[PDB]
Coordinates of C-alpha atoms in Angstrom, one line a residue:
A1 CA 0.0 0.0 0.0
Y2 CA 3.0 2.4 0.5
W3 CA 5.7 3.3 -2.0
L4 CA 8.3 5.8 -3.0
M5 CA 8.9 7.1 -6.5
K6 CA 11.6 9.3 -7.8
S7 CA 11.0 12.3 -10.1
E8 CA 13.3 15.1 -11.2
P9 CA 11.9 18.4 -9.9
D10 CA 12.2 20.3 -13.2
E11 CA 10.4 17.4 -15.0
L12 CA 7.7 17.0 -12.3
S13 CA 7.9 18.4 -8.7
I14 CA 5.4 17.8 -5.9
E15 CA 4.4 21.5 -6.3
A16 CA 3.7 21.0 -10.0
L17 CA 1.6 18.0 -9.2
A18 CA -0.5 20.1 -6.8
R19 CA -1.1 22.6 -9.6
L20 CA -1.9 19.9 -12.3
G21 CA -4.3 18.0 -10.0
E22 CA -3.9 14.6 -11.6
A23 CA -1.0 13.5 -13.8
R24 CA 0.4 10.5 -15.6
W25 CA 3.5 8.8 -14.2
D26 CA 5.2 7.7 -17.5
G27 CA 8.7 6.8 -18.7
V28 CA 9.6 4.1 -16.3
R29 CA 11.9 1.7 -18.2
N30 CA 13.4 -0.3 -15.4
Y31 CA 11.9 -3.8 -15.3
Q32 CA 11.8 -4.0 -11.5
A33 CA 10.4 -0.5 -11.1
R34 CA 7.8 -1.5 -13.7
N35 CA 6.9 -4.6 -11.7
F36 CA 6.4 -2.5 -8.6
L37 CA 4.1 -0.1 -10.5
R38 CA 2.0 -3.1 -11.5
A39 CA 1.6 -4.0 -7.8
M40 CA 0.1 -0.7 -6.9
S41 CA -3.5 -0.2 -6.1
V42 CA -5.7 2.9 -6.4
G43 CA -5.6 4.7 -3.0
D44 CA -2.0 3.6 -2.4
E45 CA 0.2 6.5 -1.2
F46 CA 3.8 7.1 -2.0
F47 CA 6.6 9.5 -1.0
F48 CA 7.4 11.9 -3.8
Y49 CA 11.2 12.0 -4.1
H50 CA 13.0 14.8 -5.8
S51 CA 16.1 13.3 -7.5
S52 CA 18.8 14.5 -9.8
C53 CA 18.5 18.0 -8.3
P54 CA 20.3 20.4 -5.9
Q55 CA 18.2 19.4 -2.9
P56 CA 17.4 15.6 -3.3
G57 CA 15.0 14.2 -0.8
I58 CA 11.3 13.4 0.0
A59 CA 9.3 16.5 -0.9
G60 CA 5.8 15.2 -0.1
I61 CA 3.1 12.6 -0.4
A62 CA 0.9 11.7 -3.4
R63 CA -1.6 8.9 -4.2
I64 CA -2.3 6.4 -7.0
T65 CA -5.5 7.3 -8.9
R66 CA -5.2 4.7 -11.6
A67 CA -3.6 1.2 -11.5
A68 CA -1.0 0.1 -14.0
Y69 CA -2.0 0.4 -17.7
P70 CA 0.1 0.4 -20.9
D71 CA 2.5 3.4 -21.0
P72 CA 1.3 5.3 -24.1
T73 CA 4.5 7.2 -24.3
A74 CA 6.3 4.0 -25.4
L75 CA 4.2 4.0 -28.6
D76 CA 4.3 7.8 -29.1
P77 CA 7.2 8.7 -31.4
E78 CA 7.0 12.3 -30.1
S79 CA 7.7 11.2 -26.6
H80 CA 11.3 10.9 -25.3
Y81 CA 10.3 7.7 -23.6
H82 CA 9.4 6.0 -26.9
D83 CA 10.4 2.4 -27.4
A84 CA 11.2 1.1 -30.9
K85 CA 10.4 -2.5 -30.2
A86 CA 7.1 -1.8 -28.4
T87 CA 3.7 -2.1 -30.2
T88 CA 0.1 -1.7 -29.2
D89 CA -0.4 -5.5 -28.7
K90 CA 3.1 -5.9 -27.2
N91 CA 3.9 -3.0 -24.9
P92 CA 6.2 -4.0 -22.2
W93 CA 5.8 -0.8 -20.2
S94 CA 3.3 0.5 -17.7
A95 CA 2.2 3.8 -16.2
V96 CA 0.0 4.8 -13.3
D97 CA -1.8 8.1 -12.7
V98 CA -1.2 10.1 -9.5
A99 CA -2.7 12.9 -7.5
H100 CA -1.2 15.3 -4.9
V101 CA -1.8 14.7 -1.2
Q102 CA 0.7 16.9 0.6
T103 CA 3.7 19.0 0.1
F104 CA 6.2 19.1 3.0
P105 CA 7.3 22.6 4.1
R106 CA 10.9 21.4 3.9
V107 CA 12.3 18.6 1.8
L108 CA 13.4 15.6 3.9
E109 CA 17.0 15.7 2.6
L110 CA 18.7 12.5 1.4
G111 CA 21.4 13.0 3.9
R112 CA 18.9 13.0 6.8
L113 CA 17.3 9.9 5.3
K114 CA 20.6 8.0 5.1
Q115 CA 21.1 8.7 8.8
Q116 CA 18.0 6.6 9.6
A117 CA 19.0 3.1 10.7
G118 CA 15.3 2.5 10.4
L119 CA 15.7 2.8 6.6
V120 CA 18.6 0.5 6.2
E121 CA 16.5 -1.9 4.0
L122 CA 15.1 0.9 1.8
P123 CA 16.8 0.7 -1.7
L124 CA 16.9 4.5 -1.8
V125 CA 19.7 4.6 0.8
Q126 CA 21.6 1.6 -0.6
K127 CA 24.9 1.9 -2.5
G128 CA 24.5 1.5 -6.3
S129 CA 20.7 1.4 -6.4
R130 CA 19.2 2.8 -9.6
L131 CA 15.6 1.9 -8.6
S132 CA 13.2 4.8 -9.1
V133 CA 10.1 2.9 -7.8
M134 CA 10.0 0.9 -4.6
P135 CA 7.8 -0.4 -1.9
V136 CA 7.8 1.2 1.6
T137 CA 7.0 -0.8 4.7
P138 CA 4.5 0.7 7.2
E139 CA 7.4 0.8 9.7
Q140 CA 9.6 2.7 7.2
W141 CA 6.7 5.0 6.4
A142 CA 6.4 5.8 10.2
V143 CA 10.1 6.7 10.5
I144 CA 9.9 9.0 7.5
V145 CA 6.7 10.8 8.6
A146 CA 8.3 11.1 12.0
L147 CA 11.2 13.1 10.4
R148 CA 8.6 15.5 9.1
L149 CA 8.0 15.9 12.8

């Protein structure tokens, strides 16, 4: 029921999601991350993580408004997430739709997060991880919301 998904601020920030209302989460091309997307249910919540930016960290909370469905950007030649070997009847990629829940006043910085022994099992803080979508245990969710104070 809980997850964490990374997104580059300039491509999509928690603030921008609040302004858009509901948005499509497309472009995931990592098999494992894809598999986690397919495990999500409507109503599930996830930490919105700002990555590849000057202040990386958890910026807020959002929710899943539409379970996994074929990522249309894979078939759209105009999209930067296009896949040449994908077709309508054979699309290996999935997307989900999300909506804003809350924007934290201050980003929960990555450094602060790595200092949480309670997050030792979260791929986010593990060396070499390239996973942009991951599950979050209730216990891990609690330690993170506790950081928000």
